[PDB]
Ligand binder design. Structure first.
Ligand SMILES: *[C@@H]1O[C@H](CO)[C@@H](O[C@@H]2O[C@H](CO)[C@@H](O)[C@H](O)[C@H]2NC(C)=O)[C@H](O)[C@H]1NC(C)=O
Ligand SMILES: *[C@@H]1O[C@H](CO)[C@@H](O)[C@H](O)[C@H]1NC(C)=O
Ligand SMILES: *[C@@H]1O[C@H](CO)[C@@H](O)[C@H](O)[C@H]1NC(C)=O
Ligand SMILES: *[C@@H]1O[C@H](CO)[C@@H](O)[C@H](O)[C@H]1NC(C)=O
Ligand SMILES: *[C@@H]1O[C@H](CO)[C@@H](O)[C@H](O)[C@H]1NC(C)=O
Ligand SMILES: NC(=O)CC[C@H](N)C(=O)O
Lengths: 605, 19
């Protein structure tokens, strides 16, 4: 292992912890009961990550080809990092900077990266939630606004944009977003999104006014309501038409898709984005426990609950998607039968699904001319399931379209969107703690101020920066920033974290500390996965990222209402300047880890 | 909006109180 001279005399040496435990109680906060701690760690690890990213990350990679590597990596890459994070956060009695600034101080920069990432996701997340808030307010009216098209000035024909496409797509792209035609077309600020953004940030600031001791009172509801609303929705979904016909599309993998580096890279990124690893949240939330709190139990419990929750959410979402696909296929076939019977004037109840081809053949062989001039639609089941859903366009395009087809639609809509909003707050609690704690650790503010002013300043700054996603071109910026803000850092930070813990602090000190804490040295599985397999898998993922990044064109989708073949969104290439923004969103939070270190290698020379 | 700002003011004043 690396030398790191002087690691001792900067760390408690297990002879004081039994007494230091009863010493920080006066100034450092502590949990009310273990239920609050476990429930907060659970709520931090579930929400708006397996409802939005997992669906189209399954779709774009063939549905079932994304679920095998995801589980292999959740077993071999997630659990040991959860355990490592909990253990060091509990043993070192420090936040997200302390546990890395106290191990070869030239690693302090790594901590900064975490903080910076916990900011780059903030601006992202509280935009999504804002949209949800909007969709939550537009309920409470029986003729739901996304159920029918509006009429133009001449109140006899529909608006052409809503006529050539669905009314839900119109309400999403024109009445809510008012999206433009390119990323180079920015417009007004669109007041009717500022209200929702301000409401989202005000609620978030209300819940985290004091960190722990105030979020620990809201978590009881916030991390519990989803597991009831989701069970209700699962029961409602598994009894539709396309259910058990759209679930199989999720569990029929194709062995030709597993050999692409893209799928494995996306699986790694998703298993690091599901568990909030390398975010600096858990390493700090676990730093409030007593020194004798069993750690394997909580790590294993959180991992299992999170994995099975992800599987249940995927099942529900693909149930609804299968229902939608079966509906559209039935529409195809009904329209084709209607055209056929309108052509030759056949009896109404004679042409059906079973004997369609026979009647088609007869009507051709009878009168070739009149039959040839007809127009047919060619469309089959298990082919509308492959309709790729764009980013952030699943929870608003398919679920509203399926909710508008059920009895008592307003109740279902209110329940669904309050569930999503609760998941959002459940995640933003930790995503805010991860920025609040390091800033206090940096002595940026004088101690004379209360914490309320610092939290308010952070919320105000992030709200003022979040204007960019309220322009006419908001969704494009959002997708651009999301394609890169959560892929490279959540790999590099995690790898540096595990390498630091194992091969700098020394794994033997770690084993002795675990023995002193819980009562036995970890099982052989933990050591075999710490010292051998996990660094190799993370290095392979890190390399595959660069293998798949270069040699593929960057393209994004646009709406273009004035473009022929309109119902399908178009693809175009990013302008040349945008490679600046990526370097500022994916380079700086990742390049800070070596950079700061270099500074020390020059400062202490 | 009203009720949530009410919660904000009550909480922050609850502070000065118990402070
Ligand atoms: C698994 O992947 C293969 C290849 O990537 C898929 O085969 C192609 O599927 C597309 C549409 O999904 C068709 O247009 C091609 O004609 C297919 N190619 C061949 C050679 O058959 C396959 O469909 C995928 N399977 C699943 C379940 O997603
Ligand atoms: C509406 O009616 C006016 C005549 O009053 C006509 O000029 C116009 O084209 C109509 N609108 C549409 C969309 O057809
Ligand atoms: C939508 O955007 C267009 C152009 O950006 C603007 O003219 C229009 O007024 C906007 N919609 C509303 C309701 O203001
Ligand atoms: C459809 O009409 C033809 C006309 O002779 C008839 O022979 C046939 O039985 C009808 N189809 C069914 C299902 O009865
Ligand atoms: C219709 O019938 C004619 C008769 O010869 C045949 O040549 C043609 O291929 C048929 N086409 C279709 C679409 O049934
Ligand atoms: N950075 C975060 O807020 C973590 C989110 C969490 N992994 C989820 O998607 O549920």
């Amino acid at each position: 292992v690396l030398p790191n001279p002087g690691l001792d005399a900067r760390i408690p040496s297990l002879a004081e912890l039994e007494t230091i435990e009863q010493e920080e109680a006066s100034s450092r906060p502590k949990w009310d009961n273990k239920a609050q701690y476990m429930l907060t760690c659970l709520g931090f690890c579930v929400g708006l990550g397996n409802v939005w990213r997992f669906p189209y990350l399954c779709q774009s990679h063939g549905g079932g080809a994304f679920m095998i590597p995801f589980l292999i990596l959740l077993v071999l890459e997630g659990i040991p990092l959860l355990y490592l994070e909990f253990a060091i956060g509990q043993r070192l009695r420090r936040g997200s900077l302390g546990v890395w600034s106290s191990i070869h101080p030239a690693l302090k920069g790594l901590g900064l990266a975490s903080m910076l990432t916990s900011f780059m996701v903030g601006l992202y997340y509280n935009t999504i939630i804002s949209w949800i808030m909007w969709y939550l307010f537009n309920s409470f009216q029986e003729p739901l606004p996304w159920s029918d098209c509006p009429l133009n000035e001449n109140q006899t024909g529909y608006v052409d944009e809503c006529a050539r496409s669905s009314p839900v797509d119109y309400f999403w792209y024109r009445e809510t977003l008012n999206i433009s035609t390119s990323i180079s077309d920015s417009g007004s600020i669109q007041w009717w999104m500022l209200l929702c953004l301000a409401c989202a940030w005000s609620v978030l600031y209300m819940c985290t006014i004091r960190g722990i001791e105030t979020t620990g009172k809201a978590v009881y509801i916030t991390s519990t309501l989803p597991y009831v609303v989701l069970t209700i929705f699962l029961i409602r979904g598994l009894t539709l038409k396309g259910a058990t016909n759209g679930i199989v599309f999720l569990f029929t993998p194709n062995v030709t898709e597993l050999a692409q580096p893209d799928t494995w890279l996306d699986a790694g990124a998703q298993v690091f984005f599901s568990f909030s690893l390398a975010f600096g949240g858990l390493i700090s939330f676990s730093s409030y426990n007593s020194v004798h709190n069993n750690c394997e139990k909580d790590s294993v419990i959180v991992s299992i609950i999170n994995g099975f929750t992800s599987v249940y959410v995927a099942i529900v979402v693909y149930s609804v998607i299968g229902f939608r696909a079966t509906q559209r296929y039935d529409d195809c076939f009904s329209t084709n039968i209607l055209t056929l019977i309108n052509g030759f004037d056949l009896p109404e109840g004679n042409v059906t699904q079973e004997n369609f081809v026979d009647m088609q053949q007869r009507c051709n062989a009878s009168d070739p001319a009149a039959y040839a001039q007809l127009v047919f639609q060619t469309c089959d089941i298990n082919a509308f399931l492959s309709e790729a859903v764009e980013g952030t366009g699943l929870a608003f395009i398919v679920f509203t379209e399926a909710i508008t087809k059920m009895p008592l639609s307003p109740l279902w809509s209110v329940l669904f969107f309050i569930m999503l909003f609760c998941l959002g707050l459940s995640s933003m609690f930790g995503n805010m703690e991860g920025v609040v704690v390091p800033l206090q650790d940096l002595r940026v503010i004088p101690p004379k101020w209360p914490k309320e002013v610092l939290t308010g300043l952070i919320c105000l700054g992030t709200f003022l920066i979040g204007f960019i996603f309220t322009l006419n071109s908001g969704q494009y910026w959002l997708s651009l920033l999301d394609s890169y803000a959560g892929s490279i850092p959540l790999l590099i930070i995690a790898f540096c974290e595990m390498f630091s813990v194992v091969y700098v602090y020394g794994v033997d000190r770690f084993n002795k500390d675990i023995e002193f804490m819980i009562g036995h040295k970890p099982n052989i599985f933990w050591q075999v996965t710490w010292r051998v397999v996990s660094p190799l898998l993370m290095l392979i993922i890190f390399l595959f990222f660069f293998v798949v990044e270069v040699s593929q064109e960057l393209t994004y989708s646009i709406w273009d209402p004035g473009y022929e073949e309109f119902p399908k969104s178009q693809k175009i290439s990013y302008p040349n300047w945008v490679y600046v923004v990526v370097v500022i969103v994916a380079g700086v939070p990742s390049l800070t880890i070596p950079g700061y270190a270099i500074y020390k290698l020059i400062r202490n020379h | 909006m009203g009720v949530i700002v009410v919660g904000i003011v009550i909480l922050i004043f609850t502070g000065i109180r118990d402070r």
